[model samples]
Target: MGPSLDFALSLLRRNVRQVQTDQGHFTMLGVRDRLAVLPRHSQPGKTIWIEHKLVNILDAVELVDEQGVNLELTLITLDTNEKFRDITKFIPENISTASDATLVINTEHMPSMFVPVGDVVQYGFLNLSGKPTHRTMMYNFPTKAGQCGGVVTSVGKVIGIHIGGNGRQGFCAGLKRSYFA
Candidate 1:
């Protein structure tokens, strides 16, 4: 671990929890207020792993635009527990168009990997409309299923959503964060 990566990742690590998904496990991130955000297609009403315990969800909203495009990442309200209730942190939108990032599988998948920007980021991202297309292939050649989830980050804020299957490069949706607001 780099001297700074530890602290930088801790800020991010605290903000995420694990949720099961069709493609794979995804990390649910706390953005602001009493809300936590998960990417599109996350099974709603399902129990999520938080703070080492299984918790029920109070509600979930799939944030999509008028044209059937998913705009905001899904927002989930959990059946709160006092011990884990104070874990909310606002991961602001990464507005800077820089190629700086590190990929993590929450804490369960350690020592975050350095993502090679552009060199590894696949360009055929035009496959979907209304989706965050800033793609990053965390595992290009080979990968075994692991981690809460894949997320791209630079500093404490978010950069992309890792939502791809095993065959192709992982699809990370780069965002403006306001999608959650």
Candidate 2:
């Protein structure tokens, strides 16, 4: 048989890390093997680095309006001296709604959890009053306040970054490959 679910979970665990924010601790994922990505609202620029080492916030963007915030995403530059030979490989691809995906939860207190993606919602703007902005996807998964870990496909390709969740489902802002372009 192919690799079991337990095995896949173990592989994903390595990419998980705890993000210490001013509010509290949160979950983060090393989507690019080195670079860490989290919910832009986490204020990565102001994250408290205690258990983990420090890094630089490369970029951050938020989609907000009269109805409040819709979605946010941030990219963290990894602290490393080794040069990446082919950084292009780290660029994330446009997530497909048809493909199966999974979320890896690695927080300081919570045990490792794997939430399977039953369906993928396409990219669209949040239907808020003010502006039609914020590209996001709705997935059938449970997410918590400090669990903005990266969402990856079953094959290990990162598709999006988990931002927030409602009582019934979760949402992730699409990680466009164009960011690397």
Candidate 3:
């Protein structure tokens, strides 16, 4: 057995960030400690801080290193009208405690799934009609279109961020806590 639907929903409330992209809007799961995680290809146009009722894109950038290694993740900064309470402690880390997992997606029309990590693979592919990039894979997960940025969790910890897929299967960028620490 896995986490109940109610527990999963609670996690979404603290971990999910709705992102407005050049293509469309989607959800990205908050991971690490500071910012929410999403694929760079999502091309974040604005970040919707629900609690703060703020929409801004002033500091959204693709995470890259001094060596110019594109981490394929987007880092967003939110500026709200009023003081926003910090809930970083409530956000879970991307540490898997089991092989079996569940996807916590807040999108109304998208269905979540319970899957095995064995189905996940590591490979490079083009995403969002963009250039080739390496990504974690899961076969036959039945992910819907525009569902990228949803969080995949195991044992209450995030394991990856859904990047892109073709409905039959999907790809995500594996999360490592050290990246944010």
Which candidate number maximizes lDDT? 2
- In candidate 3, the residue pairs with backbone N, CA or C atoms under 3 Å apart (3 or more residues apart, or in different chains) clash, namely none
lDDT (10s digit) by residue, model 3, range 1-181: 3555665666665567555556565666654334556677777665554432546655776765465655577876555443323433433453233355666665534434334433454554444555455435464576767677777665455567777777667666666665554
TM-score of 1: 0.63
Estimate the overall C-alpha local distance difference test score of candidate 3: 0.57
Note each model's CA RMSD in angstroms.
5.1, 4.7, 4.4
Candidate-wise lDDT, in order? 0.52, 0.58, 0.57
Q: What does the lDDT read for residue 93 in candidate 2? A: 62
Rank by lDDT, descending? 2, 3, 1
Give the alpha carbon lDDT tens digit for every residue of 1-181 in model 2. Answer: 4654654465455555666776566666554544566666666654346235755544444534356645566566655552323333433565445366776666676547677866677756654234243768778766666667555444535566676666667777776565434
The parts of candidate 2 lying over 4 Å away from their true place are 4-14, 46-71, 80-92, 127-133, 150-152
